[PDB]
Amino acid sequence: GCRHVAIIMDGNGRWAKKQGKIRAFGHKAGAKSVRRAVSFAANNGIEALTLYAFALDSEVKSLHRHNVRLRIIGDTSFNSRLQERIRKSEALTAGNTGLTLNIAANYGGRWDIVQGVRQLAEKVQQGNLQPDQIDEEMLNQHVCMHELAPVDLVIRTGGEHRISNFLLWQIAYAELYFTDVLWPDFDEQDFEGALNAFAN
Amino acid sequence: GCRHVAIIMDGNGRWAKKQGKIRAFGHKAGAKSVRRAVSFAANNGIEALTLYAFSSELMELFVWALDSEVKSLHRHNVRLRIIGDTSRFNSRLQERIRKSEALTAGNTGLTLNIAANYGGRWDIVQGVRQLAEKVQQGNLQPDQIDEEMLNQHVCMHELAPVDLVIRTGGEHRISNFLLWQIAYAELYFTDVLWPDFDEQDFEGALNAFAN
Ligand SMILES: O=C(Nc1cccc(Oc2ccc(C(=O)O)c(C(=O)O)c2)c1)c1ccc(-c2ccccc2)cc1
Numbered sequence: 220g221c222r223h224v225a226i227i228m229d230g231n232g233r234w235a236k237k238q239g240k241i242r243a244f245g246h247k248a249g250a251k252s253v254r255r256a257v258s259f260a261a262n263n264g265i266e267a268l269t270l271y272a273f274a275l276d277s278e279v280k281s282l283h284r285h286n287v288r289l290r291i292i293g294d295t296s297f298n299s300r301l302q303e304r305i306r307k308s309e310a311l312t313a314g315n316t317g318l319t320l321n322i323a324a325n326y327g328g329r330w331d332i333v334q335g336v337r338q339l340a341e342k343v344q345q346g347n348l349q350p351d352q353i354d355e356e357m358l359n360q361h362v363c364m365h366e367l368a369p370v371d372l373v374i375r376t377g378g379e380h381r382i383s384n385f386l387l388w389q390i391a392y393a394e395l396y397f398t399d400v401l402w403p404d405f406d407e408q409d410f411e412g413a414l415n416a417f418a419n
Numbered sequence: 420g421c422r423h424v425a426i427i428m429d430g431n432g433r434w435a436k437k438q439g440k441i442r443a444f445g446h447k448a449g450a451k452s453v454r455r456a457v458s459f460a461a462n463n464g465i466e467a468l469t470l471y472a473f474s475s476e477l478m479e480l481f482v483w484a485l486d487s488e489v490k491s492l493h494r495h496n497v498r499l500r501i502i503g504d505t506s507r508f509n510s511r512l513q514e515r516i517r518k519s520e521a522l523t524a525g526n527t528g529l530t531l532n533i534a535a536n537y538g539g540r541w542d543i544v545q546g547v548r549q550l551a552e553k554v555q556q557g558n559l560q561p562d563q564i565d566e567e568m569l570n571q572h573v574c575m576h577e578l579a580p581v582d583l584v585i586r587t588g589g590e591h592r593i594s595n596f597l598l599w600q601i602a603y604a605e606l607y608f609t610d611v612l613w614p615d616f617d618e619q620d621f622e623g624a625l626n627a628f629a630n
């Protein structure tokens with residue numbers, strides 16, 4: 220019963236340079252693998268896919284047309300026009316009922332926790348909330364994706380075995396799956412394999 | 420070149436099940452493997468070792484270890500720390516904890532951290548609450564609260580960062596152990612059950628980290 224999958228997409232650059240091709244060539248194949256993995260998730264009743272990449276404006280109409288709700292997690296506070304274009308893609312797809320897609324942009328798991336500290340750190344400095352009252356269930360309501368299904372499964376491609384300051388709070392009970400396959404190569408069968416690991 | 424290792428010790432019960440023995444046999448065997456992992460770490464230049472048992476489904480009866488192992492660890496120059504929500508506990512064994520720490524705090528060999536009802540989420544909530552008082556006490560502008568700062572209020576802030584997390588026993592989860600602290604740590608999962616995790620398995624992990 221897997222509902223929320225998070226992916227550290229790695230090996231974009233490696234994959235390209237192995238073929239004697241540039242940094243961007245990998246990111247075009249990487250963008251194609253992203254889509255691949257998005258249909259796969261939508262078609263298998265995954266409710267939430269969170270992608271970490273460690274311009275989108277050309278994917279938006281396509282994602283909208285595929286019933287995908289687009290949300291950006293991270294520190295965007297980015298030049299003012301871009302921030303408004305991000306809001307416009309969010310709003311556009313806000314009514315969609317299919318897969319929820321979260322793209323990490325200048326995101327950090329520690330930053331995420333911080334942000335949430337401060338939402339409470341002035342829910343206090345306006346005598347609204349007691350230190351004593353501060354608990355987990357609370358702080359959780361103030362971290363990214365608290366409205367979404369809890370993260371079940373975290374996938375990292377590219378062969379490294381670390382979280383690298385992707386989700387920290389959210390991954391307390393997630394399954395963690397590391398494959399050497401580089402992101403541009405990661406396909407439906409790679410994805411199913413991770414899903415079966417969860418299932419066992 | 421790895422300074423701080425944290426270990427989720429799992430597979431004690433499966434280890435005994437395998438031989439048709441009750442859980443308790445595995446626990447006794449796991450106790451031995453802990454001693455073995457503590458020596459290894461002291462004699463292989465590790466500065467800090469952080470140990471988290473893992474149930475899930477008798478755990479308390481880490482009182483046994485506290486009462487039986489402390490004076491030996493002191494003699495071996497091991498600095499003993501208990502991390503976790505201990506406020507929960509009975510007064511008298513809260514004192515035993517406090518007295519074991521006081522005994523060993525000036526030891527300059529291995530720092531040994533023992534997780535007792537620890538949760539990575541609890542750790543963070545605790546760090547925060549400290550700050551949330553520092554706000555309702557003047558002192559601190561919430562403008563000011565950043566990563567460096569909350570870091571200083573989570574467990575083990577005064578030690579080298581966690582470099583390597585080992586989890587034995589087959590499962591691929593943190594299970595709410597360290598969270599904030601494992602941000603950049605290497606994660607190492609082996610199917611060896613804890614009672615069988617020896618020097619050679621620990622060496623494998625350290626050699627894996629080194630690349
Ligand atoms: O608790 C410690 N080790 C330990 C070993 C074995 C089992 C175990 O708990 C389990 C695990 C699995 C199961 C199951 O069912 O799988 C069960 C069950 O359900 O009964 C119980 C815990 C420990 C205690 C104290 C120190 C220490 C303290 C102070 C100073 C120095 C060191 C270090 C480690």
Ligand SMILES: O=C(Nc1cccc(Oc2ccc(C(=O)O)c(C(=O)O)c2)c1)c1ccc(-c2ccccc2)cc1
Pocket residue numbers: 449450451453454455457458461462480481483484488491492495497528
């Ligand atoms: O770690 C435990 N004991 C222990 C004692 C003394 C030294 C020591 O490690 C060192 C450090 C430095 C040196 C050195 O400097 O050489 C040496 C060396 O000389 O080999 C050895 C380890 C322990 C912890 C928990 C349980 C337990 C768990 C659950 C239930 C019951 C018991 C059992 C044993």
